[PDB]
Design a protein around this ligand. Structure first.
Ligand SMILES: *[C@@H]1O[C@H](CO[C@@H]2O[C@@H](C)[C@@H](O)[C@@H](O)[C@@H]2O)[C@@H](O[C@@H]2O[C@H](CO)[C@@H](O[C@H]3O[C@H](CO[C@H]4O[C@H](CO)[C@@H](O)[C@H](O)[C@@H]4O)[C@@H](O)[C@H](O[C@H]4O[C@H](CO)[C@@H](O)[C@H](O)[C@@H]4O)[C@@H]3O)[C@H](O)[C@H]2NC(C)=O)[C@H](O)[C@H]1NC(C)=O
Ligand SMILES: *[C@@H]1O[C@H](CO[C@@H]2O[C@@H](C)[C@@H](O)[C@@H](O)[C@@H]2O)[C@@H](O[C@@H]2O[C@H](CO)[C@@H](O[C@H]3O[C@H](CO[C@H]4O[C@H](CO)[C@@H](O)[C@H](O)[C@@H]4O)[C@@H](O)[C@H](O[C@H]4O[C@H](CO)[C@@H](O)[C@H](O)[C@@H]4O)[C@@H]3O)[C@H](O)[C@H]2NC(C)=O)[C@H](O)[C@H]1NC(C)=O
Ligand SMILES: *[C@@H]1O[C@H](CO[C@@H]2O[C@@H](C)[C@@H](O)[C@@H](O)[C@@H]2O)[C@@H](O[C@@H]2O[C@H](CO)[C@@H](O[C@H]3O[C@H](CO[C@H]4O[C@H](CO)[C@@H](O)[C@H](O)[C@@H]4O)[C@@H](O)[C@H](O[C@H]4O[C@H](CO)[C@@H](O)[C@H](O)[C@@H]4O)[C@@H]3O)[C@H](O)[C@H]2NC(C)=O)[C@H](O)[C@H]1NC(C)=O
Ligand code: HEM
Ligand code: HEM
Ligand code: HEM
Ligand code: HEM
Ligand code: HEM
Ligand code: HEM
Ligand code: HEM
Ligand code: HEM
Ligand code: HEM
Ligand SMILES: [Ca+2]
Ligand SMILES: [Ca+2]
Ligand SMILES: [Ca+2]
Ligand SMILES: [Ca+2]
Ligand SMILES: [Ca+2]
Ligand SMILES: [Ca+2]
Lengths: 147, 146, 144, 150, 146, 148, 147, 146, 144
């Protein structure tokens, strides 16, 4: 995965904007910004979320989806220094995305660029390298196999 | 019960008890060690995640998913729309497993022991029993959590 | 730059750090108003009732308290337009009969920014986000 | 003394407060305030009228919410200033004139709300110390109601 | 049901959580701060022990008497005859006061949060809920503790 | 009032040796029985005062529970030796519980004192008779306050 | 009396302007300011000091009186955390004021307001509450019984 | 003797030795423990302040008054007008007690032992004997302190 | 505000804290004169003999030493008018043939105040007392 020093930085910066201490509201407002951006990059992928009511991104069903997505991302980050468990965690997340027909690996590349674009606006002294080194490996594990 | 004041209380205490980084896995492990001690039979329900060995990565991934779920649910305590849509989600995932509702009562007990054990004497047990019910009810639909 | 959802989150966190729980508040507010009156000594005259001549006095310190208390409410509401604007209208009415110029509002803006940067460090200060969201705040206190 | 608000009670109150205080979002503050007023209203019906300008009959309106946020900002400014009483005094006077000359606003109502806070806090705050809290809440109200009737 | 094993578990956990010296006073004060935060109205029932000022010698002496009652009672969990004789002795002292049994439910919730908060994560809430029932039933008689 | 902080610390430590949350009820009434037996021996006339707790059969649940609450009372008193305020209030309450019962004489409490001074050294590691006398006497007097 | 935390503050602020280290001159210049003020508030009380030569407040006899008064105040403050001794100290000071015919309790109320007015000019970040909590109790003990 | 330089010296050393807060009572207690050890009979002269028990609040109040007096007198060392008016004051308070002047010599000795014991090796004993005389003389009027 | 007996005591203590025993004196005086010459660069010209162009030089540092030494004497005498005025007259004569304007005196006043506040903190700085008593000091150095 990624270095122990790198992971440390990622976990620290991430917990700056995400932790058990603040509002689900902030959670989904980051979520909406993240997906809105994924859509503008790959509009073809928006349809994949019609099931969580992507039609209305202010709906409890979609807010809950982004909440879910960020919690997953959080769960992955907090396990960066537990290679064994993380491998198992990503394999699972990987299965939750494969069963979804219409998902191309390229969508996770776009998601990557979105995160690298959104995060710096929320995080103090965001570190693109430490994040790349820790995220990319993740992303490949969650998008390994798909189109 | 579980009015807005108790939901905020619970959010506070959960955040403290849950903690950051690796302390999270420890909390996770204690929660599940209590559950299985409280009801040893419930362990066989988790062969799919290798409950056979709690130190195994398969089971740790499960522990992580479960507390992550408790966490995202507790964070939505203030927004009923997102909370219910998410409890429905968790429900569609537990329904096909034909799980006996009495186990969710064991879970809660274990949860209270672990949150209060980590948070200390100011743990608001009444608030937690009331607000946990809301969670259990959303996932099971059983009116024992009424 | 625009005070978007992201900038509002950043400002909230950075303000929380700077404003804090209360121990560093007196020094925070003093730093701020010492800057204001230096850049615009002329403005002190509007504070005759709260000893604007001596910002070291309890009277002014209490005022400084009220001002920061006002910024805090707005920052805390930045993600709730409905209530935010309602609050800006209240501040607006508290300043209506005092003739504050859009230039004095900009002064206080920089004073607040410098104070926040002075508190959290230039290493993390997000000037674009602050300017944008402070514009949104003063802009609303002046009706528009 | 003896029921005076001591230095330790102040440290303690700032603690009970700093905890249940959200420095980033109004969700927590707002919730605490509304609950305090609901409680006061249910114990003092005639009190709701005093808040017609802020829609006291509609606790969830943008107008009452902004008012609760202002009340909570007032209490927060005073709780913090318990550490520097010189300035506290100045602040508590200003608040006094803000409640002064407003029919009904009377000391009696302050004793009422003091009871509302004592009922609300323990539900939201962890490790709540009702004694220390009231001793300093009272110290705060006494400065707020200097010029008022029983 | 509070069988012999749970009684042993509870005796062990109480001993660790109760402690020695002044830690007992701290334990008691916590227990009673929680009871009055759980049910602010229960406080009025104690004017006889000056509950207006919880740090008064009268109330502190009361705290000491109660946790001393809990201690001697828990220590007798293993001897039915002694246990019941003492529980009746306690009932005799509480009856002439016409107390709402529901208060005893709150007391138990407080007891758990206090003992659990001090004992930590391996606190056995189910065992405690079951055995506390025996005490409450023995003191109040209300079959609500049946 | 009562005794000095240094004396109380010794007594509290020596008492905790043989009495604490970890001490089972059986050891408690075992001490309780040896104590009251000794009391009765010295003042046979006092025994009848305990017919309500079935003193007739000292190994009865009723008498066991009595000695256990007595010892619990002594324990409470000892542990509060360094909090005269609370101790005064605790002794006052205990006193009331005795004066309420008739037939008790002050000499019966002095007797109990001798019993304790005789019994404890056989239970406590290197018992300190002076520190205990200094602390027990005031305690015993507060509880027997108002007895003939 | 007053809290241990309060007393601490009072003792600290007081020792700022009064301690065995500086000039009796400063001692009596604070004294003169204190009484001059007590006089302007209650001029009727000035006559009570005719015995210490209140006529000339620059006289050794009156300077010595204020010195005496401040030393007493100092002695009381330094014993704020010794309830037993302070009680005994105030009872004594109380006796030294009762035997003085013409002394009304109200004069000690004025003295209180003078101290709360003079002290802040001499002390850094004077704390009115901590002082009130510690002084008022004192004052009542030294003025308990009089008119 | 006791020129202005020695008066300043004494003021310095006294301030150090005397100290702040609670250290003051300790110094006070040592001064009086020496006095009574040096002249055991002098103790009976203080039954009015309960010298019977030096730890009693009555006697501690006395100790406090006495060192407070030494302190205010030493602080006026530079202003003869205030100093003499104050020594006269102290004199009118000791005169009606028919006190044998030799005890003021014991007092001084005790005072020197306590100041030097607390101040250390640089204690200026000659300066203290000279300046103490001025004090004793103002309070007694005895020309043995000449 | 007036430089009364109380204000003089406050100034004495606050000055003692700021001026101190000597370790922080060089930094104290540098802070002061760096402020003076920034607010009034024109004034340096009067210090040609003590290298007013470079306040980092021993020559100027020695001068700064003498100036603070002068303030110290006045502060120490603030409660002894007789000798105080005698000292102010001495300072007066040392500045008589130099043409110092009442505006340069006020500059140094603020420079000294800022320096003292910088040393003891805004939390305890008593602006009213300082201004009043510094007025009394410069006022006397200018004859009146
Ligand atoms: C996407 O969802 C959002 C959010 O709605 C939520 O999610 C949906 C998916 C659904 O599951 C909803 O159940 C869920 O709430 C939709 O926008 C919201 O939609 C509601 C519409 O009901 C907005 O509510 C406005 O109206 C309500 C109630 O109006 C009625 O009752 C009042 C009496 O109380 C009457 O006065 C009215 O005549 C009416 O009959 C009210 O609470 C608010 O209106 C008041 O406040 C305004 C100030 O904010 C004033 O301007 C008004 O004059 C009035 O006093 C609400 O404005 C609700 O506001 C929005 N959400 C937001 C934040 O705007 C969205 O429509 C949906 N997308 C689509 C197109 O389907
Ligand atoms: C002082 O009190 C103690 C303890 O007594 C207890 O506390 C009192 C205050 C009361 O509340 C009592 O109710 C309570 O027990 C006395 O010692 C006990 O004495 C009892 C006598 O009742 C002993 O138990 C014997 O009885 C049981 C039960 O018997 C019943 O059931 C059988 C059916 O199997 C019937 O056949 C009987 O007719 C009767 O209805 C019995 O199980 C025991 O006998 C077994 O063991 C024998 C071998 O030793 C066999 O040969 C038998 O066949 C049978 O299997 C008991 O004999 C009880 O053990 C003691 N308790 C202890 C711990 O010592 C004490 O005597 C009393 N002092 C006095 C004289 O007053
Ligand atoms: C209240 O008391 C004050 C202070 O006096 C003290 O307390 C009193 C109660 C008495 O117990 C006094 O014993 C005690 O000192 C009174 O004000 C002081 O009063 C003295 C008056 O003697 C002032 O002294 C001035 O005069 C002396 C001595 O004057 C004689 O001797 C010189 C020769 O050395 C001759 O030149 C004179 O002709 C005269 O015969 C002297 O030290 C000072 O005068 C010089 O210095 C001045 C500058 O300060 C110059 O302007 C003069 O020209 C001269 O050179 C003294 O001014 C003493 O100053 C005051 N105290 C102060 C600080 O002013 C006060 O009068 C009394 N209230 C009333 C009305 O009774
Ligand atoms: C690396 C960042 C991502 C994380 C952490 C993540 C996480 C998650 C999680 C936790 C779920 C819910 C699984 C469940 O509980 O059933 C989910 C669902 C889903 N994700 Fe992602 N995801 C990521 C990126 C993406 C991308 C790039 C796409 C593609 C467009 C995508 C498409 C989906 C879809 C279609 C669902 C199912 C939604 C439904 O329930 O209808 N995800 N994701
Ligand atoms: C209210 C508390 C509970 C929460 C928040 C919770 C949450 C979750 C989550 C998030 C998952 C993973 C879903 C996925 O990503 O596929 C999960 C799986 C599961 N849960 Fe729960 N759960 C709770 C209680 C229970 C209880 C009481 C039982 C039963 C004894 C249970 C049995 C299971 C099983 C068997 C799985 C599937 C494991 C697998 O993947 O093989 N859960 N739960
Ligand atoms: C940065 C945004 C500002 C905020 C949040 C703010 C907030 C406040 C608040 C809360 C009060 C007290 C109202 C009351 O309780 O009566 C106040 C008063 C006042 N403000 Fe501002 N203010 C801001 C900017 C300014 C500016 C730029 C000026 C002008 C130079 C100004 C001048 C005043 C005056 C003169 C008062 C009245 C003081 C008095 O009571 O005598 N404010 N402000
Ligand atoms: C100690 C607790 C209280 C605090 C901290 C507090 C604080 C405040 C504040 C900050 C305002 C707004 C001032 C402004 O911006 O003009 C306010 C307004 C007001 N308060 Fe209070 N208050 C308290 C208790 C009460 C009580 C007990 C009553 C009466 C029953 C009361 C009645 C009012 C009224 C009538 C207004 C004017 C509302 C409006 O129309 O804007 N307050 N209070
Ligand atoms: C099950 C746990 C409880 C235990 C072990 C317990 C024990 C005791 C004891 C030992 C006493 C003192 C008896 C005496 O010596 O006079 C006492 C007194 C008392 N208890 Fe409880 N108690 C319990 C629960 C409660 C509850 C739930 C209430 C009701 C709110 C309550 C109300 C009282 C009152 C009013 C007194 C009398 C205080 C006085 O005036 O002296 N107790 N209790
Ligand atoms: C100093 C040591 C003693 C202690 C700590 C002590 C303590 C106690 C306690 C805690 C109770 C139970 C009170 C209640 O809850 O109602 C009690 C009851 C009693 N005590 Fe003592 N006691 C002592 C000495 C004595 C002595 C010397 C006698 C007399 C010979 C005595 C006679 C009694 C009686 C007759 C009862 C009532 C028993 C009943 O309810 O039937 N006690 N004592
Ligand atoms: C709380 C502050 C006060 C303190 C600490 C204080 C202290 C003292 C002391 C130590 C003495 C000298 C006793 C002796 O040695 O004989 C004294 C004397 C006296 N005090 Fe106070 N005092 C205070 C307030 C007052 C007030 C308010 C009045 C009233 C107007 C007053 C009137 C007097 C009088 C008349 C004397 C006797 C003067 C004489 O010797 O002729 N004192 N006081
Ligand atoms: C030069 C050193 C001494 C100083 C500064 C001094 C000072 C004082 C003071 C301030 C008082 C209290 C006056 C009051 O407020 O009523 C006092 C009382 C007294 N002093 Fe001294 N004293 C000194 C030496 C002595 C000596 C050598 C003796 C005799 C052995 C003595 C015997 C007494 C007695 C008997 C009292 C009265 C105690 C009472 O209030 O009952 N003093 N002294
Ligand atoms: C704040 C009050 C001031 C004090 C206490 C003060 C004090 C002094 C002292 C002690 C000297 C040295 C005299 C000597 O030994 O010859 C001096 C010199 C001087 N001062 Fe000041 N001064 C003050 C303000 C000023 C101001 C406002 C100016 C003008 C801008 C000024 C200009 C000078 C100059 C030009 C010299 C001569 C330097 C030289 O020797 O070449 N001073 N001052
Ligand atoms: Ca099914
Ligand atoms: Ca800070
Ligand atoms: Ca602007
Ligand atoms: Ca004589
Ligand atoms: Ca310094
Ligand atoms: Ca000037």
């Amino acid at each position: 995965f990624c270095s122990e020093a790198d992971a440390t930085i990622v976990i620290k910066q991430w917990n700056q904007i995400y932790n058990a201490g603040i509002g689900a509201k902030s959670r989904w407002t980051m979520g909406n910004e993240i997906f809105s951006s994924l859509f503008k990059l790959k509009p073809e992928s928006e349809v994949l979320f019609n099931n969580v009511n992507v039609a209305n991104m202010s709906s409890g069903a979609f807010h809950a989806h982004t909440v879910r997505v960020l919690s997953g991302l959080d769960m992955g980050i907090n396990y960066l220094n537990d290679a064994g468990t993380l491998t198992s965690l990503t394999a699972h997340l990987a299965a939750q995305h494969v069963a979804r027909t219409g998902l191309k690996a390229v969508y996770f590349d776009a998601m990557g660029k979105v995160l690298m674009t959104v995060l710096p606006s929320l995080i103090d002294n965001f570190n693109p390298d430490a994040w790349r080194n820790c995220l990319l490996p993740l992303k490949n594990a969650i998008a390994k196999g798909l189109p | 019960d579980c009015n807005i004041l108790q939901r905020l209380k619970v959010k506070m205490q959960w955040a403290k008890a849950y903690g950051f980084g690796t302390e999270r896995a420890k909390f996770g492990n204690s929660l599940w060690t209590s559950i299985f001690n409280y009801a040893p039979d419930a362990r066989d329900l988790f062969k799919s995640v290798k409950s056979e060995d709690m130190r195994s990565p398969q089971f740790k991934a499960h522990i992580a998913r479960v507390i992550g779920g408790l966490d995202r649910v507790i964070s939505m305590f203030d927004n009923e729309d997102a909370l219910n849509a998410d409890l429905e989600h968790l429900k569609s995932q537990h329904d096909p497993r034909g799980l006996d509702a009495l186990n969710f009562v064991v879970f809660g007990k274990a949860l209270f022991a672990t949150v209060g054990g980590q948070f200390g004497v100011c743990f608001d047990l009444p608030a937690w029993e009331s607000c946990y019910k809301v969670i259990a009810m959303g996932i099971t639909g059983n009116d024992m959590f009424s | 730059s625009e005070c978007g959802p992201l900038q509002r989150l950043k400002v909230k966190r950075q303000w929380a750090e700077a404003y804090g729980s209360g121990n560093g508040r007196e020094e925070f507010g003093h730093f701020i108003w010492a800057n204001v009156f230096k850049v615009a000594p002329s403005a002190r005259d509007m504070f005759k009732r709260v000893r604007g001549d001596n910002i070291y006095t309890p009277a002014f310190r209490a005022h400084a308290t009220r001002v920061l208390g006002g910024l805090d409410m707005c920052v805390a509401l930045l993600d709730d337009e409905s209530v935010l604007n309602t609050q800006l209208a209240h501040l607006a009415s508290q300043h209506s009969s005092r003739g504050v110029s859009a230039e004095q509002y900009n002064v206080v803006e920089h004073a607040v920014m410098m104070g926040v940067e002075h508190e959290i460090g230039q290493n993390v200060f997000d000037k674009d986000a602050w300017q944008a969201c402070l514009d949104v705040i003063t802009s609303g206190i002046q009706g528009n | 003394s003896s029921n005076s608000c001591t230095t330790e009670d102040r440290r303690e109150m700032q603690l009970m407060w700093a905890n249940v205080w959200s420095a980033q979002f109004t969700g927590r503050r707002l919730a605490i305030a509304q609950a305090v007023f609901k409680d006061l209203f249910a114990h003092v019906p005639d009190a709701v009228g005093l808040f017609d300008r802020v829609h006291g009959t509609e606790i969830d309106s943008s107008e009452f919410k902004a008012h609760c946020i202002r009340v909570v900002n007032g209490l927060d400014s005073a709780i913090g200033l318990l550490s520097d009483p010189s300035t506290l005094n100045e602040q508590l006077s200003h608040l006094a004139t803000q409640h002064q000359e407003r029919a009904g606003v009377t000391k009696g109502g302050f004793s009422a709300i003091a009871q509302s806070f004592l009922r609300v806090m323990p539900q939201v705050a962890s490790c709540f110390n009702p004694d220390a809290w009231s001793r300093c809440f009272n110290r705060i109200t006494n400065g707020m109601t200097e010029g008022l009737a029983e």
